[PDB]
Ligand binder design. Structure first.
Ligand SMILES: *C(=O)CCCCCCCCCCCCC
Lengths: 6, 168
């Protein structure tokens, strides 16, 4: 989940 | 009120997010993420901040079939935080295949410096996967999924979702 980005 | 004990026993992926974006009152923002194979130094994935309106909370991974035979991956994350102190920042991340739990990982971040970039490394030791499971995971992209639950002082403040292909 830390690979998410707007 | 959602605390760690509320996710540590979950046996399936959640049907919805367990908090809204607005509950991120510490303004934690992931600005870099990299995964590497600890046995080869291969970089398996990397993203850096420079529609997709849910990009903030969902990510889709495209890996190879060899990924499922790895022993250990190191994940490096960089994130900014806002001006409020952040104490006991913790991620519980649960990975399922068709809602069979594969593994849950419980990571405690180091001390988080407010109003600053911060960096953390997470080490993932892979669970044993049977040959049958590996074959299924390769044949069924995106039916492997994870929930990432983020807590500050034992309170849920972020929830991100991912899914995974191993179809190369
Ligand atoms: C959020 O973006 C999740 C980041 C995923 C990092 C890779 C973790 C791999 C752990 C293996 C899970 C067990 C099944 C292979």
């Amino acid at each position: 989940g830390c690979g998410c980005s707007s | 009120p959602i605390g760690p004990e509320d996710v540590l026993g979950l046996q399936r992926i959640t049907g919805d997010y367990l908090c809204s974006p607005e509950e991120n009152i510490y303004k934690i923002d992931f600005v870099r993420f990299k995964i590497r194979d600890m046995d080869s130094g291969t970089v398996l994935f990397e993203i850096k901040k420079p529609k997709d309106p849910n990009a903030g909370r969902f990510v889709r991974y495209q890996f190879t079939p060899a990924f499922l035979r790895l022993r250990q991956v190191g994940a490096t994350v960089e994130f900014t935080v806002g001006d409020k102190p952040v104490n006991n920042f913790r991620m519980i991340e649960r990975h399922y295949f068709r809602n069979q739990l594969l593994k849950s990982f419980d990571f405690h971040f180091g001390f988080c410096i407010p109003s600053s970039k911060n960096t953390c490394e997470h080490i993932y030791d892979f669970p044993p996967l049977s040959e049958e499971l590996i074959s299924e995971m390769i044949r069924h992209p995106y039916e492997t999924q994870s929930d990432s639950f983020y807590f500050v002082d034992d309170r849920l403040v972020m929830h991100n979702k991912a899914d995974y292909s191993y179809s190369g």
